[PDB]
Design an enzyme around this catalytic site. Structure first.
Site, PDB file in Angstrom:
ATOM      1  N   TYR D  54     -18.452   3.051 -28.094  1.00 27.06           N
ATOM      2  CA  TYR D  54     -17.274   3.467 -27.152  1.00 27.06           C
ATOM      3  C   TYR D  54     -16.902   2.378 -26.304  1.00 27.06           C
ATOM      4  O   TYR D  54     -17.661   1.837 -25.428  1.00 27.06           O
ATOM      5  CB  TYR D  54     -17.398   4.816 -26.641  1.00 27.06           C
ATOM      6  N   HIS D  75       0.110  -1.782 -21.017  1.00 26.32           N
ATOM      7  CA  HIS D  75      -0.478  -1.756 -19.544  1.00 26.32           C
ATOM      8  C   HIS D  75       0.235  -2.557 -18.563  1.00 26.32           C
ATOM      9  O   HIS D  75      -0.021  -2.513 -17.476  1.00 26.32           O
ATOM     10  CB  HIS D  75      -1.971  -1.917 -19.536  1.00 26.32           C
ATOM     11  CG  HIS D  75      -2.646  -0.913 -20.097  1.00 26.32           C
ATOM     12  ND1 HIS D  75      -2.412  -0.381 -21.449  1.00 26.32           N
ATOM     13  CD2 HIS D  75      -3.831  -0.146 -19.763  1.00 26.32           C
ATOM     14  CE1 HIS D  75      -3.118   0.688 -21.574  1.00 26.32           C
ATOM     15  NE2 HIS D  75      -4.013   0.914 -20.778  1.00 26.32           N
ATOM     16  N   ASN D 186     -10.031  -4.467 -16.459  1.00 26.09           N
ATOM     17  CA  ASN D 186     -10.878  -3.502 -15.727  1.00 26.09           C
ATOM     18  C   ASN D 186     -11.166  -3.994 -14.548  1.00 26.09           C
ATOM     19  O   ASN D 186     -11.807  -5.054 -14.428  1.00 26.09           O
ATOM     20  CB  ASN D 186     -12.033  -2.839 -16.420  1.00 26.09           C
ATOM     21  CG  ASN D 186     -11.917  -1.826 -17.164  1.00 26.09           C
ATOM     22  OD1 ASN D 186     -10.893  -0.764 -17.165  1.00 26.09           O
ATOM     23  ND2 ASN D 186     -12.085  -1.825 -18.606  1.00 26.09           N
ATOM     24  N   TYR D 255      -5.136  -1.074  32.749  1.00 25.61           N
ATOM     25  CA  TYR D 255      -6.298  -0.812  31.761  1.00 25.61           C
ATOM     26  C   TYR D 255      -5.838  -1.847  30.494  1.00 25.61           C
ATOM     27  O   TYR D 255      -6.858  -2.101  30.009  1.00 25.61           O
ATOM     28  CB  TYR D 255      -5.803   0.630  31.224  1.00 25.61           C
ATOM     29  CG  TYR D 255      -6.389   1.820  32.217  1.00 25.61           C
ATOM     30  CD1 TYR D 255      -6.781   1.741  33.577  1.00 25.61           C
ATOM     31  CD2 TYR D 255      -6.378   3.201  31.743  1.00 25.61           C
ATOM     32  CE1 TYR D 255      -7.080   2.742  34.258  1.00 25.61           C
ATOM     33  CE2 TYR D 255      -6.730   4.431  32.688  1.00 25.61           C
ATOM     34  CZ  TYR D 255      -7.236   3.972  34.037  1.00 25.61           C
ATOM     35  OH  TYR D 255      -7.575   5.066  34.907  1.00 25.61           O
ATOM     36  N   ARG D 258      -7.748  -4.295  32.037  1.00 25.27           N
ATOM     37  CA  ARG D 258      -9.266  -3.992  32.357  1.00 25.27           C
ATOM     38  C   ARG D 258     -10.089  -3.246  31.390  1.00 25.27           C
ATOM     39  O   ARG D 258     -11.390  -3.534  31.268  1.00 25.27           O
ATOM     40  CB  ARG D 258      -9.270  -3.064  33.634  1.00 25.27           C
ATOM     41  CG  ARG D 258     -10.460  -2.366  33.992  1.00 25.27           C
ATOM     42  CD  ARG D 258     -10.624  -2.205  35.511  1.00 25.27           C
ATOM     43  NE  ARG D 258      -9.436  -1.347  36.157  1.00 25.27           N
ATOM     44  CZ  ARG D 258      -9.406  -0.045  36.279  1.00 25.27           C
ATOM     45  NH1 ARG D 258     -10.675   0.515  36.381  1.00 25.27           N
ATOM     46  NH2 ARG D 258      -8.332   0.697  36.878  1.00 25.27           N
ATOM     47  N   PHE D 305     -15.227   0.705 -11.649  1.00 31.39           N
ATOM     48  CA  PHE D 305     -13.772   0.147 -11.623  1.00 31.39           C
ATOM     49  C   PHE D 305     -12.804   1.057 -10.545  1.00 31.39           C
ATOM     50  O   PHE D 305     -11.926   0.748 -10.240  1.00 31.39           O
ATOM     51  CB  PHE D 305     -13.065   0.398 -12.892  1.00 31.39           C
ATOM     52  CG  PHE D 305     -13.187   1.897 -13.549  1.00 31.39           C
ATOM     53  CD1 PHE D 305     -12.352   2.900 -13.135  1.00 31.39           C
ATOM     54  CD2 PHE D 305     -14.280   1.974 -14.353  1.00 31.39           C
ATOM     55  CE1 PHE D 305     -12.673   4.296 -13.545  1.00 31.39           C
ATOM     56  CE2 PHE D 305     -14.379   3.307 -14.928  1.00 31.39           C
ATOM     57  CZ  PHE D 305     -13.615   4.388 -14.477  1.00 31.39           C
ATOM     58  N   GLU D 390      -8.945  10.410 -16.222  1.00 33.62           N
ATOM     59  CA  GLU D 390      -8.394   9.744 -15.111  1.00 33.62           C
ATOM     60  C   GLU D 390      -8.085  10.907 -13.929  1.00 33.62           C
ATOM     61  O   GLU D 390      -6.782  10.934 -13.767  1.00 33.62           O
ATOM     62  CB  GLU D 390      -7.499   8.747 -15.339  1.00 33.62           C
ATOM     63  CG  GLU D 390      -7.910   7.797 -16.542  1.00 33.62           C
TER      64      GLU D 390
END
Lengths: 504, 508, 508, 503
Positions: D54, D75, D186, D255, D258, D305, D390
């Site tokens: 795979y 993509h 990836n 402040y 300081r 990833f 996903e």
């Protein structure tokens, strides 16, 4: 296109056109001219009679300044207040701010001189491009000062024919416009106001209104590609949940067309988005025609020169924070319908419509929705005060206006992705046909983006369909099938301003 | 006060009263009764004719009678999935009354006897046990409501608010538990009534604090000795937002260059007022909506229709915007509190205390106000902007308006305290300016405040004074005092009457 | 049961125990006693020698002896300005113990007698009345603490938690009220102890839920019948974040392509773990800091020094980031809950119930989890990112960390319920897979869950099961069960021992 | 400026230099070459032996090539404005570094072409919106290397035909064998490259914030009391102690002055922490499936990833950096306030006709205000885009971008404070400050003259901002500061964490 400004009739859509339509030109009405000179007569009398009035002939110090030192004060004002940073506005938005500035001055309460307004007018019509850094205002002395700075021939300017920012002095020579000169009060008159927030806001709400209509077109196509039932459009459903937006959206969908929540509850979700957009549109339309000057000049008033707080941009700031939230939801529910289109168990279509299809396009849509959630945080909820000045509360609406435009820009792409995916669904269902208006939209999309046979570079298709949506061609296509009331047109005409039942 | 519900006439203010006023009681109109039985006739015909209709007698194929009843019970029990602290008795009972009002529209298919039991339980003083967390917008909360009506889980009463066995509580009120026929399970738990009931309280409190904010501002205006110049009606005529004009008129009533927190107050309070007024309109419609599914239309072309009216995006969005609008009232108020304590800005003794050698005055009270404003900024984040698809099935978009309603109440609660701190500080300013006097209505407010909080001579425990003035504001006595000096239109009363619902021009 | 405080050795876990364990008691070390009296000698000399020092006997002008005592009382009273619901007894007492620990560092100038009375009050079971809203980061909360020690305002006890007259409660406890000499007023109310005590609870609960999240995940992993492939140590060796490696090892210990919510769990839980560990370090330092002002250094070049150690930005920032880190645990857990209920994703009966034609199972429980995640997203907004200044004071920047601490506790409280829902659902998955068995430690967890929640045969009221499993998780019994199967380094224990403080290399 | 990558030694500062320094060039180490070919041998063995794995030969040799191309093209789905040339090239170099770890299964030839393209001056076309955390951005990168879509060059930054640009640069387009498509796209390199710039800029502005503060301290004539090392010894946070020491080096009560060590301190520690997270991330194998030539399993599916680690870190960086601007704006307020500064109002003499730096403070406040919105954690959200796999993503793309925006904003704020404080020094003449601060003042005065009469002030703000970003200001005070207080420890890569137990 020549628009006549009078400080009472400007709509966000006309202002948008003034910035984005080629050949746009502005003029001011005769009644505006009369108001401007009448207000200036008040100022001229105060100065000539050597009378002490705060904001007119006083210093920064309620004592009277001598005349020559009064001219220098105006210049110092413009220069020292040109404090903005970051990328300059696009030419269209800068010129929108310019035109809006002129419109507000037309109300005749600023005390501006007529010849200054004319030089602003002439510069616009000649094609001047002001240099306005987009960051700095706390809500808009900075942006408006940068505008006036360029009108003085100082700093940077560009033109429509040459958008490279260069010496402002040479650009004014190029355009045949003589730089402005500043008399008493003219410095404040030019830089007091909410015109940076409101001009940017005008673009936002215009784009928002148009994408709200288009969202229903994308939804209709998805509805067809997913083979959903018309049951949820039954007018009895919306008669008993009778929000204006929900009923109007359902009617718009029935015109186009005569399940999952992202389809079935769409009138109940798009509806409130539509109503927020309509509400914001009303707020901004009023704001584009407001006298945001200080001090205000009232030639016919009990007091001729009055100090107020109309420069405070909380009204458009708040409205734009809410516009972002309303527009965001259109993209939010659209992304879910995109998910259904790509999902084989949900669509009963091939997965993602050795090929990956529109898989990653859905990804892009989800990323846009996600970043819109950050932009949904109200910028106007914050105020940072300058302690020993007078300004102890400000609107911070500069970022409200800018992120509103960003959210709408993002949602436009989301709707484009849905429409693109849904049209592919229609292809996959052939020889089945959809309704006449939706078949026309499909053909329109197919004229810029071919059906998805083999895999190809998909960002090109996304951008093309986005260009198509922004062109107005998609809405123009379905427009005659939709009942007038469901076309989102009521906001295009200026309503009479609210009037107190008591003038006490 | 006995209120007659009919699913068309309920306002947020009446619903608030139903939850918070002692002796509140509800009944339903004759027309509502007619609608309910007419809708139920449709359901009964479907069931008796053994006709298959999804949502009526189907399942999770037509489910047989003996189990169709069991399905209703399983529904109520399995959907009672909420967690966290239970709603206050007043809010739980508001949700109960609102539930009844929606059923009065006659599109749920509920039986009349069940409504009667919901009705009787309310009037007897039942306190439902409703955990405040769980809804994604309101199956959970409404199921917990129905669970108690079944005599299961926990219940309390107004006379004994300790949550105990629901069965014994019903036996204490002498109320018989509901029984569920076909569709009754869904009819009871479909809707936006948790979000809308909580939202009703929020917008009511918001409207009242918006008015009171102008009273605090007026007092600060006097204590700071500001000019009336910024109230000139010419100013607001040329910037003619409804809210800005109305606020200025309200201020002119109380007081008949300054800092922005005073001078730009109409321009800031104004938009807050308009947001509140807008939200009020959205919610008023929502309180009278048929949020059932499937919907029953006895006179419709289709008698049983599936829709999406249960989706709470409308009140969710409105409540997210209410929070933002109300927040700004506290935001600008805190700045005026700052001016009161600042000797440079006030021309008063620093921190509103004379002999400030050994004393600190209202110094830390301003601090408390600033902290409240600051946390309100977090609550200003829109909860309805998020959606978590609770299924890769059909429920793929939800409103998440449960938290929108709750944080809206929190923001208003916080802003109420801020306004109280400003009013408290400003009244001390009035003391420091004696023998000077202010206007007649403002002198009355000052006297009213002085009746619960003495002037600040030496230092004392100040959280007591803050809480007392807050109680005073919430009592309504402050507004009641200035009310007759204010023009009717500037009293924020227009929203109290239900407007006719929008109607389409076209029949398409 | 008896903790000895010395201002150097306190951990969040011990402080949590001091507030929540029955019979908890505190004492202070001899070295602490010595430091306290040494610092007080400096103050006593300054006062006796009639020397002018800001913060000891000023205003500003040298204050006479009689007025100096009155100044302390005025300080405590006027600064008791907090509003809202009081802290729970456990959290109020945590703030009390932490207050004592900080004073043990011996830089406040407090008298020994005063510390002893705080000490005795704690051990006697006093419950301070501390309103949770007001601090801008903690004069208010610490003043309310001192107010009760003066026998003023309200107090409660562990035996009677009804808030009543502070004077009578001290009589009840046999504690004589404190008296205030020079500097004692400031010494008691300067510091970050409200933020840090609440923060201590938050990070302790966070650390424990981080471990439990991996137990829930392991069960889900088994119920979903996922592969162990993603736990391959080679994967995490080449992406060698400490958290990711430790989480993977913890999971391998319990379990001795897939979906991301399972496969990318080490890569998501990991960063959550590291944020929690980082926050733990920040807070551990803060619990042992001298946050007083002015500071007293008996052995220093300057004996009395003005600084800014009272500023709570450090714990405020850390708690804003804790919320974000803890939130993600619930975020990814909710997705695994979604997989359990989804029939196409789980290969189990839909919503984990057989005969689901009349039953809905854990459908609405997932809903409750999603709602909790959603509201956590609002709480993820950093409260410390805001500052509202008082213009004419000296306090022009504050941390606003009061709300940071409170919403951190809320997020962890929410995530605890989410993890409980996942564990509850996953255990039902195990039932559905019988006679299949899982690992020895996970079978023990399953049995443990089954001892408080029976398997889901028919539908029942599910909020009861959720609450029971939540109680189980919080009890510590679940972690105690798997603890001996996990390598020491993966047990999240390193933070339990106080590390030596950072030391500058250079003298500059 | 030739950097040798090996997937183990890259720091955010070196990566930043690779993108922004003229003449930057990359090469890969011999060990990296060995690792790459060893991993590729595993992949070649699998496809030669026709073994089913795979992610290698899944979903024939003929069409397996077509699959790679379809992958890259489909993509490439990102939208919006493209990254600046410097950031696009940072992503390119980082991509190469990760591949050097030798677990992607990429071919050596492909790496060398990426390598050559960078050195020749290629400018990838990477739309900044789309990633859910970075298939999109990395695909757009690979698309250009295929000679498809758009490309630019450093000599001609107008985006044009990618094919012609590669011809211009003398680079032959890549070709894709098995697994090469996934190997290239990836990873978390879009988030991490942008994050690298952010944390580098953050570290540098943290140091500069103390320089601005020191100048304000002098202009306001504050006491050194709050810098007493005894104060910070008893509140011993690393950041607080280090900041105080840095301030003492430059200077040897409100402040915002300081409590500055107590506020800057935690900001510094957040920046240092984020720096550590990102340094690890730049040298991570974020591929999938992973190739382990010496492992028990040669090809392993994991989740490296997932960009939650850099996403979370960048959300926190924004919050930490924001506070620097927040407290700085308050000091700007003190400078302009005549009651608080004892200086002329708004730092201008003759203020009857002049406004001075009044509106500059206004600009600073607006920047702080918008930073509060950007402080909302983007990684707190996840939108599951897959009904199955996903189902959780980091959404760290926007985390990286808004982190850069916050730092960009804070840089301007610090510039405004420094500009205002230097005018304060002018108003106090003939008084002098310390030697290092007098040098900074002179440096500022070399780009911005003192404020006599009113002038266009956005020019001065931008000039001082340019000055700060140039590094000249820090370089000026650097030798006066103790080494440990120079924020340099993070510049060297620490050894990665190692488990004690073998479980």
């Amino acid at each position: 296109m020549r628009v006549i400004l009078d400080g009472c009739s400007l709509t966000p859509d006309v202002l948008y056109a003034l910035g984005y339509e080629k050949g746009a030109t502005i003029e001011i009405s005769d009644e505006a001219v009369a108001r401007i000179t009448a207000a200036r007569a008040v100022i001229d009398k105060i100065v000539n009679d050597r009378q002490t009035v705060y904001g007119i002939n006083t210093g920064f110090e309620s004592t009277i300044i001598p005349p020559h030192q009064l001219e220098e004060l105006q210049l110092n004002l413009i220069r020292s207040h040109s404090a903005c940073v970051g990328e300059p506005l696009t030419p269209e938005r800068a010129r929108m701010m310019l035109a809006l500035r002129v419109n507000v001055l037309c109300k005749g309460h600023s005390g501006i001189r007529l010849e200054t307004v004319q030089k602003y007018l002439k510069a616009f019509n000649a094609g001047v491009v002001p240099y306005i850094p987009e960051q700095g205002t706390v809500g808009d002395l900075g942006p408006l000062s940068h505008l006036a700075l360029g009108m003085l021939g100082e700093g940077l300017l560009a033109t429509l024919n040459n958008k490279k920012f260069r010496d402002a002095g040479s650009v004014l020579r190029e355009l045949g416009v003589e730089p402005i000169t500043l008399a008493a009060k003219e410095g404040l008159a030019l830089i007091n106001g909410t015109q940076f927030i409101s001009a940017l806001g005008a673009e936002a709400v215009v784009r928002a209104r148009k994408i709200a209509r288009l969202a229903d077109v994308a939804l209709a196509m998805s509805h067809e590609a997913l083979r959903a039932t018309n049951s949820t459009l039954n007018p009895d459903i919306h008669r008993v949940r009778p929000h204006k937006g929900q009923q109007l959206v359902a009617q718009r969908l029935r015109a186009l067309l005569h399940d999952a929540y992202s389809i079935r509850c769409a009138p109940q979700v798009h509806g409130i988005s539509n109503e927020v957009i309509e509400w914001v549109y009303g707020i901004l339309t009023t704001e584009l025609n407001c006298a945001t000057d200080n001090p205000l000049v009232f030639p016919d008033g009990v007091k001729k020169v009055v100090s107020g707080g109309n420069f405070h941009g909380e009204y458009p700031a708040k409205a734009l924070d809410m516009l972002a939230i309303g527009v965001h939801e259109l993209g939010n529910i659209s992304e879910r319908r995109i998910e259904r289109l790509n999902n084989p168990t949900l669509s009963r279509l091939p997965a993602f419509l050795l090929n990956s299809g529109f898989m990653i396009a859905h990804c892009t849509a989800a990323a846009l929705v996600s970043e819109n959630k950050v932009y949904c945080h109200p910028a106007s909820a914050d105020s940072i005060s300058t302690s020993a000045a007078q300004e102890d509360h400000v609107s911070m609406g500069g970022f409200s206006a800018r992120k509103a435009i960003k959210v709408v820009e993002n949602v436009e792409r989301i709707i484009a992705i849905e429409l693109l995916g849904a049209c592919q669904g229609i292809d996959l269902l052939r020889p089945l046909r959809t309704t006449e208006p939706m078949e026309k939209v499909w053909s329109l999309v197919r004229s810029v983006s071919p059906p998805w046979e083999e895999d190809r570079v998909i960002n090109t298709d996304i951008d093309n369909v986005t260009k198509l949506l922004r062109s107005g061609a998609v809405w123009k296509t379905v427009k005659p099938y939709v009942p007038e009331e469901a076309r989102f047109l009521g906001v295009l005409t200026v309503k009479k301003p609210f009037e107190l039942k008591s003038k006490m």
